[PDB]
Amino acid sequence: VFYSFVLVMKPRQRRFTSQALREIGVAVYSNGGLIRSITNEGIMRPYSRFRDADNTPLTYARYIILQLDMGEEEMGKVDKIIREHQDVLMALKLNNLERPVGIRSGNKELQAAYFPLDTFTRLEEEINWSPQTSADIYTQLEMNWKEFSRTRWSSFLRN
Amino acid sequence: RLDPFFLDEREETVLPSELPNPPKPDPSTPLRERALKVPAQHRGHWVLRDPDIAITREERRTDPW
Amino acid sequence: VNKQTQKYRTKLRYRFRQPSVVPLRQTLQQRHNTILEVLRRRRINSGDQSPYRYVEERLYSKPSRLDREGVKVNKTYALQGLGDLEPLRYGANFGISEKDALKYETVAEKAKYMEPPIPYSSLAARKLAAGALWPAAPDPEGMISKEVRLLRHESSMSPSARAFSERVAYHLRRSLKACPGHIAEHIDFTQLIIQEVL
Amino acid sequence: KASHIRIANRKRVEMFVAKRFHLPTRLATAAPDIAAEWHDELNPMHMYPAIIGIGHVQPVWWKCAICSHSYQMSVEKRVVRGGGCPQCVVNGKRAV
Amino acid sequence: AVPPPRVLGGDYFKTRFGYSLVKNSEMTQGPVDYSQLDMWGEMPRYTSDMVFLYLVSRRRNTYAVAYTYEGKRILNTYTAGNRSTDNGHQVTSMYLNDLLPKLREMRASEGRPMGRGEKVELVVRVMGFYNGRQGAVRAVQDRANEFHVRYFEDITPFPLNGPKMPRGVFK
Amino acid sequence: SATRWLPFVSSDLKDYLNRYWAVMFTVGARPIETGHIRHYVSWYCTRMKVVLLDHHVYVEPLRQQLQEASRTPELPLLFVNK
Amino acid sequence: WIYDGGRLERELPRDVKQELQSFVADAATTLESRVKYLKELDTMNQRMKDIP
RNA sequence: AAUUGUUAAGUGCUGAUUUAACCAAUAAAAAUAUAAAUAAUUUUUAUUUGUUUUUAAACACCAUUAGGUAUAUGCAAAUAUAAAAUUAUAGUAAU
Ligand SMILES: [Zn+2]
Numbered sequence A: 001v002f003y004s005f006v007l008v009m010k011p012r013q014r015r016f017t018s019q020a021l022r023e024i025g026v027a028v029y030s031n032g033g034l035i036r037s038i039t040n041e042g043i044m045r046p047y048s049r050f051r052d053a054d055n056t057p058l059t060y061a062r063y064i065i066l067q068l069d070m071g072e073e074e075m076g077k078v079d080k081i082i083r084e085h086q087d088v089l090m091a092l093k094l095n096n097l098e099r100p101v102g103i104r105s106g107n108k109e110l111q112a113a114y115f116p117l118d119t120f121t122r123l124e125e126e127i128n129w130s131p132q133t134s135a136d137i138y139t140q141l142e143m144n145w146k147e148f149s150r151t152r153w154s155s156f157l158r159n
Numbered sequence B: 001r002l003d004p005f006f007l008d009e010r011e012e013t014v015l016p017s018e019l020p021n022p023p024k025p026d027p028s029t030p031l032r033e034r035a036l037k038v039p040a041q042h043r044g045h046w047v048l049r050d051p052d053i054a055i056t057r058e059e060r061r062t063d064p065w
Numbered sequence C: 001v002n003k004q005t006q007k008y009r010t011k012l013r014y015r016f017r018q019p020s021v022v023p024l025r026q027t028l029q030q031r032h033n034t035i036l037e038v039l040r041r042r043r044i045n046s047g048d049q050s051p052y053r054y055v056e057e058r059l060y061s062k063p064s065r066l067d068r069e070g071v072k073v074n075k076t077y078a079l080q081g082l083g084d085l086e087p088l089r090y091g092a093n094f095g096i097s098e099k100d101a102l103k104y105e106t107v108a109e110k111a112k113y114m115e116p117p118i119p120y121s122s123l124a125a126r127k128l129a130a131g132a133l134w135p136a137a138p139d140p141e142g143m144i145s146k147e148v149r150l151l152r153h154e155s156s157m158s159p160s161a162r163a164f165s166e167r168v169a170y171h172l173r174r175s176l177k178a179c180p181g182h183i184a185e186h187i188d189f190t191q192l193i194i195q196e197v198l
Numbered sequence D: 001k002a003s004h005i006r007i008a009n010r011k012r013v014e015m016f017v018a019k020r021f022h023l024p025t026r027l028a029t030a031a032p033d034i035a036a037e038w039h040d041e042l043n044p045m046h047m048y049p050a051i052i053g054i055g056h057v058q059p060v061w062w063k064c065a066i067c068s069h070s071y072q073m074s075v076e077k078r079v080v081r082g083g084g085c086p087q088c089v090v091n092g093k094r095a096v
Numbered sequence E: 001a002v003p004p005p006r007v008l009g010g011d012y013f014k015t016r017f018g019y020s021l022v023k024n025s026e027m028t029q030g031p032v033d034y035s036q037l038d039m040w041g042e043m044p045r046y047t048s049d050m051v052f053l054y055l056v057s058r059r060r061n062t063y064a065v066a067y068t069y070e071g072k073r074i075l076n077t078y079t080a081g082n083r084s085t086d087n088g089h090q091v092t093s094m095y096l097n098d099l100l101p102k103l104r105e106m107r108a109s110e111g112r113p114m115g116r117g118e119k120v121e122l123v124v125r126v127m128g129f130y131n132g133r134q135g136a137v138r139a140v141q142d143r144a145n146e147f148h149v150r151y152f153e154d155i156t157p158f159p160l161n162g163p164k165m166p167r168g169v170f171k
Numbered sequence F: 001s002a003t004r005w006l007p008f009v010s011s012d013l014k015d016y017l018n019r020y021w022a023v024m025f026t027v028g029a030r031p032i033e034t035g036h037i038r039h040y041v042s043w044y045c046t047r048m049k050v051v052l053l054d055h056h057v058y059v060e061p062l063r064q065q066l067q068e069a070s071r072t073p074e075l076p077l078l079f080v081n082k
Numbered sequence G: 001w002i003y004d005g006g007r008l009e010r011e012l013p014r015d016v017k018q019e020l021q022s023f024v025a026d027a028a029t030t031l032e033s034r035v036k037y038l039k040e041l042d043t044m045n046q047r048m049k050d051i052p
Numbered sequence H: 001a002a003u004u005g006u007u008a009a010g011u012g013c014u015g016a017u018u019u020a021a022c023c024a025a026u027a028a029a030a031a032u033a034u035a036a037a038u039a040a041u042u043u044u045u046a047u048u049u050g051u052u053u054u055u056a057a058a059c060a061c062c063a064u065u066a067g068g069u070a071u072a073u074g075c076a077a078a079u080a081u082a083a084a085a086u087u088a089u090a091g092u093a094a095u
Helices: A012-028 A072-085 A116-120 A136-142 C003-015 C025-041 C051-060 C062-069 C108-113 C120-130 C159-176 D015-022 D077-080 D084-094 E010-016 E083-108 E132-141 F013-019 F032-041 F059-069 G015-025 G027-050
Strands: A002-009 A034-044 A061-068 A088-094 D004-007 D011-014 D057-061 D072-074 E051-057 E062-069 E073-075 E122-125 E149-153 F024-027 F046-053 F077-080
Touching: A002 A012, A002 A072, A002 C051, A012 A034, A012 A061, A034 E010, A072 A088, A116 F059, C025 C051, C051 C062, C108 E122, D004 D015, D011 D015, D011 F046, D015 E073, D072 D077, E051 E132, E062 E083, E062 E132, E073 E083, E083 E132, E132 E149, F013 F046, F032 F046, F059 F077
Parallel strands: E051 E122, E122 E149, F024 F046
Antiparallel strands: A002 A061, A002 A088, A034 A061, D004 D011, D057 D072, E051 E062, E062 E073, F024 F077
């Protein structure tokens, strides 16, 4: 992934959030960029209540992961569009996607010994792992799991 | 009249010591005489922001909170 | 560096500091044990003094060791008859002699010109067989208490001491939660009361 | 270093130029009657009078308050140079 | 060291304590999806009818406030000037003297009698590390028939940055 | 000096013994038995490495290897000269 | 760290202790000791004056 | 391992906790080591002081309870980091 954003948005109506995401995608595509992915993560209750433009503390918020491939000047344009949006309370810019964290400030001998195509070609869920994600889930995809998981409920149906 | 943000938080944070629904006084009620106007970031607890427990200048020289 | 890095550098310098380990309390503990052994073994005439301080002055003072080396001091400042209870500093086979050190007027000249001391002797062999080369460890006073009869008043101490104790009380009551977290996970702060600093 | 503040919790500006320029020259604060005629539908959602200044030279949409008419005018032309509705000025000369 | 004794049934377990394990509401729901975990899972479990007592001890003052589950101030903050160890003890005792009929009035307006047998559920939180901390909580300890304290904790400020401190503290 | 400072950590008991002269492996829930060995070792002016097994990244490897060197599962354990 | 528990007692202040030592102690022994100390100081000053 | 970041980052001034801090710019790159100055005339991260007035709400300080003063950001001036050259002092009384 070239760039990723975690958009925290106000839980408005469906049409307002749809228009906000549509304007964000239009600003991405008009500057000559590509959307790798956009995923909605539902409404969760954060540990800190963000304030909107009219200084109202919001208890709930919607999280959206946005993975993009854009040029850096155009990414600055889209970031200035996103950070000045009325519905976006907070959005961090994941700029450590091509190079992993700890290489630049870590060991000096282990600085040019990495491969950027290892991290650039995979998605953001394969770089920053979720708690439900693990290596055995990745090995299950290449092991022909359809012919093996058909017998996993043969003991629980009778009890 | 201006500056509501300067005495208040950027984002409402809730400490673990005040859980749940942290006790916040009403902003219309004024504080005590000669008291200290501390921002809502560098406060130890919201009970310390009560107008009767608002620390003054002479209490600041003796007690920290 | 800027102001922030300089403040963090001097904070790390004061936090992680190598102190000078000078074995002074073990020296005084060995001297206390030797004085107690001398007071137990031999009957000592006090002469309007405390017997502990009298045996201390007769053992470890400068005219006592100079009388051991031979100076013709006034009247017998050191103990004459001691066997294995004699301190190893003033043994006959030891490598430190104050008659050789009296011609040097500076400690640097003593460190420069004097010979290295003799490591092993017969009295050193007897103290090795007795295990008296290092004093025994006392009861640990680090974590039990400080049991004392009275407490000093604020009028007895200096006004600078009162101001300093007020500053210690302020910064202790302010940041008592700002301790190392591996000790803070066991301290029950609901019962802790700091009443005063003297 | 430099300290910053966020205008309407969105627009990160530097603190010195905010007290001189950025804060008192916003549309919603300095011209509240003009900012009440802001068009909420045709304008972009990342553009609103809480962050857009007085001298925004690019034309934005304005919803007129006397008549129901939307038009495009610059924000500096509306506030500094002095602007109004094009249908209201063509009805003003028609009446008198 | 020694394990606590065994309970064999919930019917007399309800009589052994002031609560019961088996709920009588009989909550019938079908949430096949995974449940939503709380933000603060490792915390005291605060029931809605619990009074939060705040005891702020200082050098020459001790304050006692009582808040509800939602943050509503029940009684005004008692000051020694308005009304030491004995100072905090008398302030907390005269606050708990007047806290009972105001609690009965505020709970009888909704439908809670709180007349006989039911003790006021209390959570005590202390500030200060002073001598008045000693006498205040003791003034809650003799009220065991009236105020049942479940969570005795403290609310002590962590000095994150601090605006500034006066000159006598530094120099 | 020539290398930036770094905290030592190891998953094996043998690297702790070969590095330090006096190593002690304690727990945070036992402060009295830890502080008594702190008084005895510092009385003889001996450099000592105290390893708190609370909040360590190799607790389960080190709790197994301390059971093999000392048959009793009691902490703290003093290790001098391997 | 000094544990108190309410059982340990404070000492007397400075001025009350000085007034108690001025009120209780006998005047004759302190007076003759001060006179002997004054004569010792005068003898020391005279011996310093004698050496040229 | 450090400096700067406004148009780039983190940001309540990262140093309260903590010997460890994302990202962006910066680690080397003419001949000669004997060669008789092969080099430049620049900058300030630190301390004060100025620059503007409903134009810091606060916190702190001097007149005693209320006024002003500054303080942090934006710029700016002065001084300073660092040995050597040049001139002189030999003995003090403390914890
Ligand atoms: Zn019109």
